A paper describes a structure:
Purified protein was crystallized at pH 5.5. Therefore, the holoenzyme structure was determined using single-wavelength anomalous diffraction (SAD) from a Pt derivative at 2.43 Å, and the phases was extended to 2.25 Å using a Zn-SAD data set. Two neighbouring zinc ions are identified in the center of the cleft. The two zinc ions are separated by 3.5 Å and referred to as Zn1 and Zn2. The precise side-chain arrangement around the metals facilitates recruitment of a key catalytic water molecule to the third equatorial position bridging between Zn1 and Zn2. The catalytic water is stabilized and positioned by hydrogen bonds to the main chain carbonyl of H457.There is an asymmetric arrangement in which the carboxylate oxygen of D278 is slightly closer to Zn2 (D-Zn1 2.5 Å, D-Zn2 1.9 Å), while the catalytic water is closer to Zn1 (Wat-Zn1 1.9 Å, Wat-Zn2 2.6 Å).
ASMD is a result of mutations in [name] ([name], E.C. 3.1.4.12), which hydrolyzes sphingomyelin to ceramide and phosphocholine. The structure includes an N-terminal saposin domain (residues 84–167), a proline-rich linker (168–195), a catalytic metallophosphatase domain (196–538), and a helical C-terminal domain (539–611).
Author numbering: 84 to 611
């Protein structure tokens, strides 16, 4: 008799559920996973053990509530008649019935119009345990630190200011960054888009994450003084890394410990309005200038690595629907909008990325600039119209990281933006990138000098930095290897790998520049 298959399936996963609520069973799950982690040589056995113990609690809870949930598992196994499998099912937010205005590019600024200067910091990745002289090529996922051991005699230990390896930064190198800003300023505001702790993800307590938050926050406030700083939340701020339960998780395993600390650390910078949304889901909007609205998104709700989204990936925290409300209100007032975030939209989950793309196309006249980080290299994402995928209408700048991780010079970014006056377009006009050349900074007894690496319009011959200029740059680089090599050099903050980037590497790199929407290979149809 097959009329009983659904009842026994539900009985199995119901009993599975209550078994996995008991911590001796959770520990047993961990032990097997540690044993497999060691067999497949993912990491040294100390790291295998540490990372599984850190992850196992929230991970088993999520699986219990999603994949192993009776209505889900039995939906998958036995079809819609028994349950309903909807893990990562597709979803859509709703645009308002206001008609889209005719597409209108930004006006060229009048001669002598005000220019706003924005400092951009991202992926600082302070490593409290950074240790000069240790092995840069140790067996762990992060080196140059306490516990990395010592290098072989043939190779130098980690340099004093950092190293070209899988290493993060000592605090003094961030202090040095902030202390050298004078020539690059003055700044009207700072956009600070996330990733304060380092990549020592196998052992990160809530307290070391908070000490990363509070130490680096106080360091930037000391060097930037009264200049406003607008943070965005990176994927490394939480513990375990990428763990960002949406607001429907209450209780202690939620992100309240993190967002509330951010609200107290960033109170000098954000108005009360902003601090309220920051406590709920780590995003907010404010008004830097009359006529300009800034929106700081928590991209961890789009993230492929945010395992909590297995429970429910549909617009987590209602953030995209909230974003639509702000963009519409901005369109109604004639405001322009800056968006800042950490993970770039092209790297998000499919549904989230497709909805964001739709929002950007709809509000192309109102959105004036987009700024992201997370990849640590210097690149960008072009957005196109939904109807034909061929009219460029927005561009996201992905700034490179202050951290070395992996193999790079430290760097940061400055934007010139159409400034503070009525009728301003508020679009990026040009940008510059500064690096510390570790090859010369790590000379014993040298004092670090942060150097201008390049300015965008001058090295690429751009007449402006509107979306069409970046579209055009990609197709120029398709046919001009020398120009692509310049881009590849700068992509790595002046320290490119020694293995040549040949024809497939180039095409893949160029494709990423046009891929502002995930899982959309048609965007690259003119490259391959
Ligand atoms: C995952 O979370 C999303 C929202 O975060 C859930 O979607 C929500 O589901 C409810 C239940 O169907 C929807 O409510 C319905 O509203 C319609 C119209 O507003 C109304 O006709 C019905 O009476 C019902 O109340 C709600 O609209 C929907 N929200 C969104 C944004 O889609 C979803 O169900 C969750 N999935 C799981 C598996 O928990
Ligand atoms: C709330 O949940 C967190 C999640 O782990 C608990 O954190 C740990 O607390 C113990 C107690 O000192 C530490 O030894 C661990 O290192 C902590 N883990 C992390 C990742 O920081 C916390 O104890 C819980 N608190 C309450 C009141 O339930
Ligand atoms: C839940 C829902 O409505 N999903 C739809 C999906 O079926 C459709 O393919 C897509 C079009 O891009 O729009 C969205
Ligand atoms: C610090 C200061 O006074 N700023 C001025 C303000 O007085 C004035 O109301 C505003 C008009 O929008 O222009 C600005
Ligand atoms: C160690 C190293 O690479 N040193 C180079 C040097 O050879 C070169 O002449 C100079 C100018 O390009 O840049 C630096
Ligand atoms: C048992 O399954 C058969 C097959 O569909 C169905 O015709 C029958 O009505 C079911 N019996 C009950 C009591 O639901
Ligand atoms: C921007 O301009 C407005 C209106 O002229 C002024 O009130 C405000 O103080 C200005 N802010 C900055 C940072 O220049
Ligand atoms: C960094 O310093 C080394 C040491 O002289 C130099 O050869 C190299 O060209 C420099 N690169 C950049 C991008 O400054
Ligand atoms: O960071 C180590 C700390 O973690 C937590 C508890 O286990 C404490 O006993 C311990 O001091
Ligand atoms: Zn990072
Ligand atoms: Zn990141």
């Amino acid at each position: 008799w097959g009329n009983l298959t659904c009842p026994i399936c539900k009985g199995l996963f119901t009993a599975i559920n209550l078994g996995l609520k008991k911590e001796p069973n959770v520990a047993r799950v961990g032990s097997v996973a540690i044993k497999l982690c060691n067999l497949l040589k993912i990491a040294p056995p100390a790291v295998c053990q540490s990372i599984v113990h850190l992850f196992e609690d929230d991970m088993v809870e999520v699986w219990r509530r999603s994949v192993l949930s009776p209505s889900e598992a039995c939906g998958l196994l036995l079809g819609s008649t028994c349950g309903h499998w909807d893990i990562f099912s597709s979803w859509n937010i709703s645009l308002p019935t206001v008609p889209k205005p005719p597409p209108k590019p930004p006006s060229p600024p009048a001669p002598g119009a005000p220019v706003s200067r924005i400092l951009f910091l991202t992926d600082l990745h302070w490593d409290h345990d950074y240790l000069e002289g240790t092995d840069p090529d140790c067996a762990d996922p992060l080196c140059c630190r306490r516990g990395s051991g010592l290098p072989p005699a043939s190779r130098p230990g980690a340099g004093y200011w950092g190293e070209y390896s899988k290493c993060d930064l000592p605090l003094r190198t961030l202090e040095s960054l902030l202390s050298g800003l004078g020539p690059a300023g003055p700044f009207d505001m700072v956009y600070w888009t996330g990733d304060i702790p380092a990549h020592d993800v196998w052992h990160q307590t809530r307290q070391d994450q908070l000490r990363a938050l509070t130490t680096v926050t106080a360091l930037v406030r000391k060097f930037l003084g009264p200049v406003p700083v607008y943070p965005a939340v990176g994927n490394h701020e939480s513990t375990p890394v990428n763990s960002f339960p949406p607001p429907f998780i209450e209780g202690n395993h939620s992100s309240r410990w993190l967002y509330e600390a951010m609200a107290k650390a960033w109170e000098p910078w954000l108005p009360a309005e902003a601090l309220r949304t920051l406590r709920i889901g780590g995003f907010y909007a404010l008004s830097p200038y009359p006529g300009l609205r800034l929106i700081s998104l928590n991209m961890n709700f789009c993230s492929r690595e945010n395992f909590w989204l297995l429970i429910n990936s549909t617009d987590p925290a209602g953030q995209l629907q909230w974003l639509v409300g702000e963009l519409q209100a901005a369109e109604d007032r004639g405001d322009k909008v800056h968006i800042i975030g950490h993970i770039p939209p092209g790297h998000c989950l499919k549904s989230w990325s497709w909805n964001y793309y739709r929002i950007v196309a709809r509000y192309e006249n109102t959105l004036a600039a987009q700024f992201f980080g997370h990849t640590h290299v210097d690149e960008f994402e072009v957005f196109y119209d939904e109807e034909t995928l061929s009219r460029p209408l927005a561009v996201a700048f992905l700034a490179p990281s202050a951290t070395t991780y992996i193999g790079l010079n430290p760097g940061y970014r400055v934007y010139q933006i159409d400034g503070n006056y009525s009728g301003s377009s508020h679009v990026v006009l040009d940008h510059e990138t500064y690096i510390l050349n570790l090859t010369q900074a790590n000379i014993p007894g040298a004092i670090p000098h942060w150097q201008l690496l390049y300015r965008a319009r001058e090295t690429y011959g751009l007449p402006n930095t509107l979306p069409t200029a970046w579209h055009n740059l990609v197709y120029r680089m398709r046919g001009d290897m020398q120009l692509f090599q310049t881009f590849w050099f700068l992509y790595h903050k002046g320290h490119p790998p020694s293995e040549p980037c040949g024809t497939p590497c180039r095409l893949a790199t160029l494709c990423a520049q046009l891929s502002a929407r995930a899982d959309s290979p048609a965007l690259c149809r003119h490259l391959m």
